[model samples]
Target chain A: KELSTIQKREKLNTVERIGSEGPGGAYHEYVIKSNSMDSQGNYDVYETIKFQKGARKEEKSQHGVIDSDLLEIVRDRLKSFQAGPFSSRENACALTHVEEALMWMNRRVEDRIERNVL
Target chain B: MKELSTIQKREKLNTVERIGSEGPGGAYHEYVIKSNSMDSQGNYDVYETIKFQKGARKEEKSQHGVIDSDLLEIVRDRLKSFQAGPFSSRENACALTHVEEALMWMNRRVEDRIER
Candidate 1:
């Protein structure tokens, strides 16, 4: 049975470095706060936070739904990995999975439009 | 320039049950992929897990450390069907995203071994 409205928020992305380790290095950290009914009629609330090496104190944080802006946050992180100098199996596999995530996120956006919902 | 190479294996995470218009409606077994290798600098990674489903190719329980290109394609197909299915939710999307992450981790190990 679907619950009577829900509010779940959780951080999803990894605390990955932006580029080669250097001065003023940065990391990508994202949290997706969602309050929607899941396919299984259950609800989820996510709120996990962690910082990577050399990560600066984020000036501000977005604590809301996984809307367009949230998707962009994830998209940009995956793209940064695409710019790599290390050529290893992990690198390639990581990139492939990242590409799929990007595709699904895009599909989610499209699915929203197709259903006339946002 | 070449550098020290290393490999590691560990269960990353468990995948949620995936449902669609298949042979029948049911909840599948819980599966999780094991990590092979990661960067010395400590990079976040994932791996491929055996998905037990109807008409799905069953993987040997001892094949956790091995990477299967076939499973990756299966995941691609599965996610596509979810999009077209009558159901859509944050849970399904998140599940799909995690599966993609696992594939990425598995590929990383594959490439690292090849370069060696």
Candidate 2:
């Protein structure tokens, strides 16, 4: 069930970021929308990383109604990964699943700034 | 039901593109799968081209599916691994995939809306 009702005070204006390293040593992250940081709602969590990834790398987003501690682990780890490699690059870096997806989607917007196809 | 209820009720969701529809990018299933290859980086783009096909061929699925024997078949063979998943978990990966798939577009839509 999606979140249907809430007290004005219970409404959430933000999402929590969860991160961790994956089975292939790749990074993974999930941005969860939750009302109760203490409990859960509408869904305990929704995976932000959708499109599939490399065969050797494992997906950490549990997908649904998840209880996987690994998802939490990856999410928590990536929270630190966020402040990491934060500026101009000295080294090539890895992106979490959500970061990949967001970047993937952003390419189109850049194209939109150039094309009417958007 | 995430499809009937939660799908439409997303608070942060904003954008949508029909990959498998009768509109502009009618590419539909084809777009989803091809996107697995669409990247600014990685040999993933150089790795697979006309040769290594990844999903059920129009002929492939009918022969598969366990209780076997020409179960179901369709014409357009464009749909395949939206990029692979934990298919063995019995979570019905496609169901969740498609939802998050739609949400992928939705997330982009919202981003587009706000920035434009």
Candidate 3:
């Protein structure tokens, strides 16, 4: 069943609100929606953009497009996370909190995008 | 010096008697003495031999040792004397019993060597 015009507008407004309040702006929401959708609409989409801006720079550099060490910081941060053991409940909770915060940030970003588009 | 000789003879007799009736044969006694010797005077020696015959075989085969499993089972059964819990008393009596049993086993091995 199709959403009523008013209902669609309200849905769009809600999406925008969520996006603007998220971490990465509308880019996060756009990536989330695009990656989450399936041909038959059955899928679970991750809320975060897994790509690091550094990785894009690395790929471009490999192609002789741009040279930058932007990804080095991202790689180092990931290494630190790997080295730190999250065995204790306190550590696990902290990690979960960080993930939730990131998701929220991404949502806010998406909200801004929605506002702009609508 | 004569009195010391008498004491030594008594000590050696007691040692021999103790060795005659222990487990793991005389090999236990040999290793215990070799590994636990202190410089000249005083030392603490482990009464039990930690070597496994299986491990010796592995070492001979590839210059590596046999992979012995954890001592959990041995601790649970044979070494119950060493077991302690957070709230339990430190029962030196039980600890001594295990040590005595281990020593008796080693002594028997030594007695065999004396006989040889």
Candidate 4:
């Protein structure tokens, strides 16, 4: 299969709970920014990924409408997606008992929507 | 202010990965895997609900044969603790796929250690 030209961003999500025996007692913030996107140019902004926190917390971002017929596909294997093991289990099972935390960031990002691949 | 500090911390993210998918009408498997863990010393962690891909290999660390019950259990348990966004959807398969690929290296390390 082929991958799109999506870029990258890193954020944090706080872990709200942890463990079976523990009673929602302890918690902490764990940061994560999974593989993101990267592209240039423009096409059409047809939809949006909206987020609302409260009365004062209102946020909305625009997303380009993707054309399925023309997404670029280059069957190139990437070296980045490879996984690695731990030094030991001491802190291993300890998935960092993170209370789900990867804070998002607002930045000026440019995207290139592929309209043709031929 | 604490909020400001948190916001500032968000600016420190280094690694960027494409891990999700926006299908015909939705995001399929192209996601941006961003985490502070990257460039932070050393660490590893690992998913979601979906039909098993046809001919997909079995997870040696969790199933097949027992490795280190206590350690593998802990590792697997740690992996379970991870809770990322996009929830459980086919659109998020790309991210999960990355996890699988990454775990292979970790599992390899464990197997190699035991083999030695």
lDDT (tens digit, per residue) of candidate 2 on A1-118 = 1212111232322233245434333223333243322223253223242222333223442222111111122222233334444321211121233233333333434554557644
Off by over 4 Å in 3: A1-86, B1-116
Chain B TM, per prediction: 0.39, 0.23, 0.24, 0.26
By TM-score, who's the top model here?
Answer: 1
Chain B TM-score (model 4 vs. true structure) = 0.26
Pick the winner on lDDT between candidates 2 and 3: 2
TM-score for chain A of every candidate model?
Answer: 0.32, 0.24, 0.28, 0.14
How many angstroms is residue B83 displaced in model 1 relative to the true structure, after the best TM-score fit? 12
* For model 3 chain B, the run of ten residues with the poorest summed lDDT: B2-11
Candidate 1 has an fnat equal to 0.11
TM-score of each model, paired residue for residue: 0.27, 0.19, 0.17, 0.21
Ranking by TM-score: 1, 4, 2, 3
Ranking by lDDT: 1, 2, 3, 4
- How close to the true structure is residue A62 of candidate 4, measured as C-alpha lDDT? 18
Top-scoring candidate (lDDT) = 1
Kindly list the per-residue Cα lDDT of model 1 for residues B22-115, writing each as its tens digit: 2222222223222233446774233222222233123322211111332332333344444455554565576466555655565555455567
Candidate 1, what DockQ?
A: 0.08
**Model 3 chain A lDDT-worst window of ten:** A62-71
- Candidate 4 lDDT, tens digit per residue, B28-65? 22322122332235531101111111111232221111
Residue lDDT tens for model 3, B39-64: 24563221222222222221323212
Q: Report model 4's interface C-alpha RMSD after superposition on the true interface residues.
A: 19.6
